[PDB]
Design a protein around this ligand. Structure first.
Ligand SMILES: *P(=O)(O)OCC(C)(C)[C@@H](O)C(=O)NCCC(=O)NCCS
Length: 1598
């Protein structure tokens, strides 16, 4: 009975087998972790039985246990060896069974001991099969174990054959194991000839089949196939004679006509592809297509010739010399992979993209179209669609190859469908493609000619039609040629499916991971096959992103962005777009976020606002609302206009009695009804306004710009304003950057430009060395000042799947090396000139490492090493391969790769990784460097630097942040915390900025400015740096290099004005800066009389960077790796990522603790949320501290609630003389008064007072210097009922008369000499004389309450009224922290015209301790005070930094003070040195720093100073029991940790106020909302909390 090692997948697997072995008394060891030769689970083992073990055993282990190592493999070996055996046995449909075998050297190949067949039912899921096989093999082992142990079985070698599978082979099928075996194999079937001819080859082939058949009809005129072919051949010979070659583009700008079809075919036959340009398009679209398309030839009319503005070499289709005599077919020069046409996508996501479609793409469609629709020459097709839409390639090309006749739609009849149907019935139009919009509308017509009406492009919903024609619903974007699927609408559907794939077309429904979705499961519609176009014109990055090579399958597929599912019958259901978001008039917004604003309308009950796209793709918003009666259109537009920008205002509003609902109660959005320029849209009037309207549409990628539309409300960024200025100078108009914002409409711009009064970047000739740009010089300077610094290393990481070939990544980067001079640029110092050298070729470091996900970052950090700017390439890369990922990392230098350069690098790396080619870089950085160097000598520069001189000449504001002690020199060690604005808030921000003619940058800038303002004591002027793109010359947009310029922003936050007003002022202050942005930061420093000095950065310590969303997917998946670097104190880098804002707080680790950034991070969020919701609120009303910070601040600082006895201080004196009469209570030199002796003396003096009308609040006055008489006077003034008002006998008489007159005191107790000094005293009971002492010694009745005054302390001085209970709170507070027990004693050092004496004078009676009345002679004398400490064994002593300094000067050499417990310093800020110096002079003693204003009853905060701790700023500490302390700014709101503010005390210990000075009392004791309406005392003292909560005194607010 031997031990047995059970190796299985998880612990409970094969547990039946384990239990059986144990019943045979086999000790079994279950192990799922990887076992090695040296594993402790191997010795004393007789058998090893593995069972789907997740690892392979070392060949040492297998040989050691020869004949004694069995594996339970759930497959009919040799079939399905290795991983996922059951699944592959089902997918590959290989023989099924379970096999117990001898593990041998290879994977699942040894001699079988016991094998058994198994069967899976069609209805079983792949999990069921997996389970059934696992159960069958376990039972098999249980039955034949005995035969195996005893060796009765004869092992037999596996049959020859089988299969093998690894972990990754199933990734493509991961989502399928919950499908039935039937369903699985059904998907297997669902996912299981070449094209030789070009179109004109087939057309010419068709011309020879039906030459005299009508080919094209245009009103009265018409051409036959022969005539069309010949006329096109004539133009083709002329076009080919003009240089047209394969893949060349020939623009065609004509109306639908015969010349149109002739020109189209003429371009093909010539060899090239025709770029169609509908002349009805606006000039903006018409100039764009001519420029973007590489077309030199423009086939056009004289009617439309001027619409090209001489941009193209025109070949007039009416000039007879444009047609050759030769009418024959030209020699074929085209392959099926050559371009046939270039269509431009919609202008929704911006400017259209040239879709490059190859011949085989069109031929495959036409070769499928003809037989699918049974097209014959008898058919007559309508040339209905604008020639620019591929819907017209359908119209023209599919029907020409079928011999059908084309019928140009009359311009008049195109949109008057009544006349269209008439024409269709007249001419007999049998087949045609109509866009869904026009199709549904045409169904209403009484058509009788059509047999097949194909539709698509938009969601078809209507099936009913007054015609006998088969309605066909087709789908497929322009990228995959007209349509990739076709459905025969045989019946109505809630979702009319788009059909099955067309010829040579496979369609995969894939999830985000590109893995197969089970049939019926929705996913992204991926198109594979012959329809896939070549890609986008001049957009290789977009081609690589949309035309992907599947990682598992290897097939090239197109990513449609559409959601669809396969229905059980094979047809595909179109489920709209994947993205919840939609781009409306230039903004990606969530239409459901407009719903609350509509529903907020009084008349509106429900609302469900969807996004609908016009026929031409223009997206508009429809706001459906359930209201009793229809609401006036203009009333809703104005309603939303009060809160939303134009683009969030639905173009149309639809009233409905109620919404259609789904089975789940949701609004059935599909069941909502369907429905232009917009109100206040003024079309251009003058020829100038038209030009201005064209440049606008181009810059903003949005058409139809009204002359009152605001630029920043139509998607205008600052980058786009630059494009406008650049493209206006091209148009001949000179516009200034700030002029665009002051004239943000074309009406305003037309008046601005009444002159109409070029300058490309001059590429330099080759030199050994070139000028560097100003910023190139700066980057170089920075790096050479710390050659070992990785501070400007630009490190990024991309997580690639294991399927990626690392060598492809390596090779792509090397191309980027050979493509951009920046990556071959080396910077050198030739004398005093920073100089760049261009290397022709550079070798890229590309390292490969294998590790684990746990060590990727560690392996990468070691790779981030400094760059030698004299060595190219300034870029390193590598791949860290883990079990899951191949992590691509690359590191570049900032002198080469700024944010935009990186976008260009990501852009182009994506193209190369996606097997695309890049156009050669037209310009070089060095050319811009020289241009800008010469521009620095122009008048424009002198005017720009003049702005900076005038702006930065005066005193500049400084922005102090709640940081740690600055390093003596600038450090760059840092870390990042990232705050995520969610997409919802981010759209709210963009909507706010657009609503009020602002950019998102201005908005975020004003939020950061307010944030910095609030953290800078709500300063009016804030200064912070920002980064401009620094791409001054428009010819530098595409160059890798350091362009970005740093700008200082002098912004003025007016906290009394609203947030918007602040936005306009910041805008007003920013635009001049951005107008003069091209002065190098270093030259702005010169003009500002500022130089790089010290531990602070020159003009600003906070950088605010902002870069828009990534331009490409690869850039999106690029993870900026911060190598522990912070270029400034703090950098807020708002990054548009995943429709939100990744606000990365890059901070100096020496200036901020992770907790200090976590708080500032939380504060910024809280503030950003307060701005977005407080557009019209005064900025002063925005809170900086978060509610969680207030709670923790209370918990850590103000959780001081400790119930205390309300029994009065003299009642407490009474009890002690009654319980322990004879104990020592006072000690003045030889006097050692007891509790009974003191109390009675007090009772005598008390009666005297009551006999002279001393009610509560009555103010008695004292001027008796340190003597028992003082205690008698106090303790008994208190007993009498009135308050004691101390006065100094040594003060001038003008003040004693002032204090007495202003106090209105009723009587005066003064030590015998000081009665004459109390001149003209109303009723003067000589303190010392016995006459002032009644013989009665009975404890008078305590009529005083805790609310009546106990003493009046004077500060023209002011008298602080403080009530009794306020004092008890303190005395019990100090007693808890610093108990003055019977053994203890208190020294009296501080003069009693100071709130500190009150502690001495009463801080002894709580614990029945004694009070040493130190003599006035020994007041400032520390040696004399030193005697008391040793003499009477003082335990409590109050002190001040001024007296505790000399007291310390008598150092350890003086000893004999064992009883001394506490030293309580107060009144002044304690120096740092005064703490440790004390400790060496007096160990075993507790030192305490105390703070308390006279208005807060003696004390307020305390800080215990540990012996083993040294404080840099000795804090005044946390508040006492029932004390609450608040640090507020000049607007009355709580400050966060570190931020200076006015210290305020609250609680039961606040002084009643100033005596008969109410204007002053209400000034300083203000009912604050932070104390639940109760008043706070404003101290006039600047302070700031610490991380732990201890308050730090900063000084009076002066
Ligand atoms: P506008 O108010 O929309 O924005 C102004 C702007 C300074 C942000 C803009 O003109 C600009 O230059 N953005 C470029 C930001 C950048 O280049 N970041 C690079 C970081 S290395």
């Amino acid at each position: 009975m031997g031990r047995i090692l059970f190796l299985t997948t998880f612990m409970s697997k094969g547990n039946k087998v384990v239990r059986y072995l144990e019943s045979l008394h086999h000790e079994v060891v279950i192990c799922q972790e990887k076992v090695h030769a040296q594993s402790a689970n191997l010795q004393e083992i007789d058998w090893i039985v593995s069972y789907a073990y997740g690892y392979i055993l070392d060949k040492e282990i297998v040989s050691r246990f020869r004949g004694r190592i069995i594996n339970l493999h759930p497959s009919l070996l040799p079939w399905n060896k290795g991983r996922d055996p059951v699944f592959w046995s089902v997918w590959d449909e290989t023989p099924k069974g379970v096999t117990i075998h001898l593990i041998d050297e290879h994977v699942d190949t040894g001699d079988i001991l016991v094998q058994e067949e198994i069967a899976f039912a069609d209805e079983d899921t792949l999990l069921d099969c997996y389970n059934k096989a696992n159960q069958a093999i376990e039972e098999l082992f249980i039955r034949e174990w005995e035969n195996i142990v005893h060796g009765r079985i004869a092992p037999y070698r596996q049959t020859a054959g089988g299969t093998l599978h690894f972990k990754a082979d199933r990734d493509f099928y991961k989502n399928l194991n919950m499908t039935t075996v039937r369903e699985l194999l059904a998907l297997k079937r669902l996912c299981a000839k070449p094209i030789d001819k070009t179109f004109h080859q087939l057309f010419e082939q068709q011309v020879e089949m039906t030459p005299d058949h009508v080919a094209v009809v245009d009103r009265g005129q018409s051409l036959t196939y022969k005539q069309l072919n010949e006329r096109a051949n004539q133009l083709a010979h002329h076009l080919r004679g003009k240089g047209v070659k394969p893949d060349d583009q020939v623009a065609i700008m004509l109306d639908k006509s015969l010349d149109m079809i002739v020109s189209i075919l003429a371009v093909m036959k010539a060899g090239g592809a025709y770029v169609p340009i509908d002349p009805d398009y606006p000039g903006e679209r018409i100039a764009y297509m001519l420029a973007d398309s590489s077309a030199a030839i423009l086939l056009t009319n004289a009617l439309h010739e001027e619409k090209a503005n001489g941009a193209c070499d025109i070949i007039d289709v009416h000039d007879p010399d444009s047609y050759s005599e030769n009418t024959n077919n030209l020699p074929h020069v085209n392959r099926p992979d050559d371009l046939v046409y270039v269509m431009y996508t919609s202008g929704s996501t911006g400017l259209a993209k040239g879709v490059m479609i190859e011949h085989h793409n069109l031929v495959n469609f036409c070769e499928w179209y003809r037989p699918y629709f049974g097209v014959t020459p008898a058919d007559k097709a309508l040339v209905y669609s604008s020639f620019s839409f591929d819907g017209s390639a359908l119209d023209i090309f599919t029907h020409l190859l079928a011999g059908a006749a084309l019928h140009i739609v009359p311009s008049e009849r195109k949109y008057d469908l009544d006349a269209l149907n008439d024409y269709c019935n007249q001419e007999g139009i049998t087949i045609s493609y109509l866009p869904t919009g026009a199709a549904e509308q045409f169904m209403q017509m009484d058509n009788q000619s059509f047999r097949v009406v194909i539709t698509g492009g938009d969601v078809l919903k209507k099936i009913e039609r007054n015609g006998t024609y088969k309605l066909y619903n087709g789908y497929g974007p322009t990228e995959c040629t007209i349509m990739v699927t076709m459905f025969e609408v045989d019946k109505p559907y809630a979702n009319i499916p788009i059909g099955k794939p067309i010829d040579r077309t496979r369609i995969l429904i894939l999830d985000e991971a590109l893995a197969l979705q089970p049939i019926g499961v929705a996913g992204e519609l991926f198109i594979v096959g012959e329809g896939l176009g070549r890609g986008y014109l001049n957009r290789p990055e977009l081609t690589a992103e949309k035309f992907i090579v599947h990682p598992q399958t290897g097939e090239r597929m197109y990513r449609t962005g559409d959601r669809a599912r396969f229905l059980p019958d094979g047809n595909i259901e179109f489920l709209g777009r994947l993205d919840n978001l939609v781009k409306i008039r230039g903004y990606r917004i969530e239409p459901g976020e407009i719903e609350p604003f509509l529903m907020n309308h009084p008349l509106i009950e429900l609302t469900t606002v969807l996004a609908k796209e016009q026929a031409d793709g223009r997206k508009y918003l429809v706001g459906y609302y359930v209201a009793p009666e229809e609401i006036p259109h203009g009333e809703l537009r104005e309603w939303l206009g009060n809160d939303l920008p134009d683009y969030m205002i639905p173009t149309y509003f639809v009233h409905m009695k109620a919404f259609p609902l789904t089975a789940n109660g949701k609004v059935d959005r599909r069941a909502l009804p369907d429905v232009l320029l917009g109100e206040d849209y003024v079309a251009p009037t003058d020829e100038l306004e038209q030009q201005l309207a064209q440049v606008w549409s181009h810059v903003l990628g949005i058409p139809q710009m009204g002359i009152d539309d605001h630029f920043l409300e139509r998607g205008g960024d600052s980058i786009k304003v630059m494009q406008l200025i650049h493209q206006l100078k091209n148009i001949g108009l000179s516009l200034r950057y700030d002029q665009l914002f002051t004239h943000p409409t074309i009406r305003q711009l037309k008046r601005l430009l009444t002159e109409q009064k070029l300058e490309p970047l001059r590429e330099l000739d080759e030199q050994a060395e070139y000028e560097t740009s100003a910023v190139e010089k700066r980057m170089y300077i920075i790096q050479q000042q710390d050659v070992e610094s990785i501070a400007y290393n630009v490190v990024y990481t991309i997580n690639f799947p294991l399927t990626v070939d690392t060598e492809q990544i390596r090779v792509a980067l090397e191309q980027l090396v050979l493509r951009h001079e920046g990556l071959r640029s080396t910077y050198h110092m030739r004398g005093d000139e920073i100089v760049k050298r261009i290397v022709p070729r550079a070798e890229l470091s590309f390292v490969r490492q294998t590790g684990e996900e746990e060590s990727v970052q560690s392996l990468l950090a070691e790779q981030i090493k400094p760059f030698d700017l004299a060595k190219a390439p300034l870029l390193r890369a590598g791949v860290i391969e883990t079990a899951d990922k191949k992590v691509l990392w690359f590191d570049s230098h900032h002198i080469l790769l700024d944010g935009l350069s990186k976008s260009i690098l990501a852009r182009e790396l994506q193209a190369l990784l996606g097997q695309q080619v890049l156009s050669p870089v037209e310009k070089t950085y060095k050319s811009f460097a020289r241009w800008q160097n010469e521009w620095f000598a122009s008048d424009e520069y002198e005017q720009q630097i003049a702005y900076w001189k005038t702006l930065l000449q005066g005193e500049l504001p400084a922005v102090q942040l709640p940081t740690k002690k600055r390093p003596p020199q600038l450090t760059f060690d840092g870390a990042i915390q990232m705050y995520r604005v969610n997409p919802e808030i981010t759209r709210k921000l963009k909507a706010t900025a657009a609503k009020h003619d602002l950019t998102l940058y201005m908005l975020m800038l004003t939020i950061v400015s307010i944030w910095l303002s609030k953290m800078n004591s709500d300063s009016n002027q804030v200064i912070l740096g920002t980064v401009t793109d620094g791409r001054q010359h428009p010819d530098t947009r595409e160059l890798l290099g350091m362009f970005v310029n740093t700008l200082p922003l002098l912004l003025s936050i007016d906290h009394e004005e609203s947030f918007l007003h602040n936005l306009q002022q910041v805008k007003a202050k920013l635009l001049p800066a951005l107008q003069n942005q091209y002065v190098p930061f270093d030259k702005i420093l010169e003009a500002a009389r500022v130089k790089r000095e010290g531990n602070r950065h020159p003009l600003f310590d906070v950088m605010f960077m902002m870069q828009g969303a990534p331009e490409t997917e690869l850039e999106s998946n690029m993870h900026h790796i911060n190598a522990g670097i912070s270029k400034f104190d703090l950098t807020l880098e708002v990054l548009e990522r995943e429709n939100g804002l990744n606000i990365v707080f890059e901070y100096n680790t020496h200036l901020f603790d992770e907790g200090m950034i976590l708080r500032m991070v939380a504060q910024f969020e809280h503030l950003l949320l307060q701005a977005v919701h407080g557009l019209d609120q005064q900025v002063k009303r925005f809170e900086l501290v978060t509610e969680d910070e207030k709670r923790d601040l209370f918990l850590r600082v103000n959780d001081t609630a400790k119930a205390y006895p309300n029994k009065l201080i003299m009642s407490m004196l009474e009890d002690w003389a009654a319980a322990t009469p004879d104990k020592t209570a006072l000690v003045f030199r030889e006097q050692r008064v007891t509790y009974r002796e003191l109390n009675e003396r007090v009772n005598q003096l008390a009666h005297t007072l009551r006999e002279k009308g001393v009610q509560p609040d009555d103010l008695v006055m004292l001027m008796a210097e340190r003597s028992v008489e003082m205690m008698v006077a106090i303790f008994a003034v208190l007993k009498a009922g009135g308050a004691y008002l101390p006065i100094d006998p040594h003060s001038p008489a003008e003040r004693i008369a002032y204090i007495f007159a202003d106090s209105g005191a009723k009587l005066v107790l003064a030590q015998s000499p000081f009665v004459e000094k109390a001149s003209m005293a109303e009723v003067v009971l000589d303190l010392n004389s016995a006459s002032s002492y009644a013989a009665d010694t009975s404890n008078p009745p305590l009529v005083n309450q805790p609310g009546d005054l106990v003493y009046v302390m004077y500060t023209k001085p002011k008298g602080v009224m403080i009530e009794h209970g306020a004092l008890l709170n303190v005395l019990h507070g100090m007693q808890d922290e610093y108990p003055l027990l019977q053994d203890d004693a208190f020294l009296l050092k501080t003069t009693y015209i100071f709130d500190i004496s009150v502690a001495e004078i009463f801080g002894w009676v709580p614990g029945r301790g004694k009070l040493v009345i130190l003599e006035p002679e020994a007041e400032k004398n520390p040696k004399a005070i030193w005697q008391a400490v040793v003499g009477a064994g003082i335990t409590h002593i109050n002190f001040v930094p001024s007296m505790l300094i000399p007291f310390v000067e008598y150092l350890e050499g003086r000893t004999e003070a064992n009883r001394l417990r506490y030293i309580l310093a107060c009144g002044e800020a304690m120096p740092d040195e005064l703490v440790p110096k004390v400790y060496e002079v007096l160990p075993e003693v507790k030192l305490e720093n105390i703070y308390g204003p006279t208005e807060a009853t003696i004390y307020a905060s305390r800080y215990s100073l540990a012996k083993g701790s040294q404080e840099s700023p000795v804090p005044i500490g946390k508040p006492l029991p029932n004390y609450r302390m608040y640090i507020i700014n000049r607007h009355g709101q709580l400050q966060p940790i570190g931020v200076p503010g006015e210290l305020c005390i609250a609680g039961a210990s606040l002084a009643r106020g100033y005596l008969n000075n109410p204007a002053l009392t209400e000034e300083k004791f203000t009912p604050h909302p932070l104390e639940k309406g109760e008043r706070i005392y404003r101290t006039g003292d600047l302070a700031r909390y610490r991380e732990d909560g201890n308050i730090e005194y900063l000084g009076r607010m002066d």
